[PDB]
């Protein structure tokens, strides 16, 4: 590994453009992203992939006041993951 030349988009080149092709960051991701770095050092037994599923459920206790902290971020965090929704190819 560490060598080895291959594309996934192909064809198209961001010459000038803004912004790439990334994975989105909605409310649950900031959420499940940020509490399981907290929950990693505060519990080093639980794992990643067990992470996943405390994540949840502690995104479903949260209350509306909370969820708004980072429900407001997504709208922000979703402009790097996206740009233009509107009649385009592509």
Request: aromatic letters at 4%; proline letters at 6%.
């Given at each position: 590994?560490?060598?080895?030349?291959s594309?996934k988009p192909?064809?198209?080149?961001?010459?000038?453009?803004?912004?790439?092709?990334?994975?989105?960051?909605?409310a649950?991701f900031?959420?499940?992203?940020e509490?399981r770095?907290?929950?990693?050092e505060?519990?080093?037994?639980?794992s990643?992939?067990?992470?996943?599923?405390?994540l949840?459920?502690?995104?479903?206790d949260?209350?509306?006041k909370?969820?708004?902290?980072?429900k407001?971020?997504?709208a922000?965090?979703?402009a790097q993951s996206?740009?233009?929704?509107?009649?385009?190819?592509?």
């Amino acid at each position: 590994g560490s060598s080895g030349s291959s594309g996934k988009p192909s064809q198209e080149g961001g010459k000038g453009g803004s912004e790439k092709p990334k994975r989105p960051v909605s409310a649950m991701f900031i959420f499940s992203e940020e509490k399981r770095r907290q929950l990693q050092e505060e519990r080093p037994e639980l794992s990643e992939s067990e992470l996943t599923r405390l994540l949840a459920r502690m995104w479903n206790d949260l209350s509306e006041k909370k969820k708004a902290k980072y429900k407001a971020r997504e709208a922000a965090l979703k402009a790097q993951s996206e740009r233009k929704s509107g009649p385009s190819s592509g």
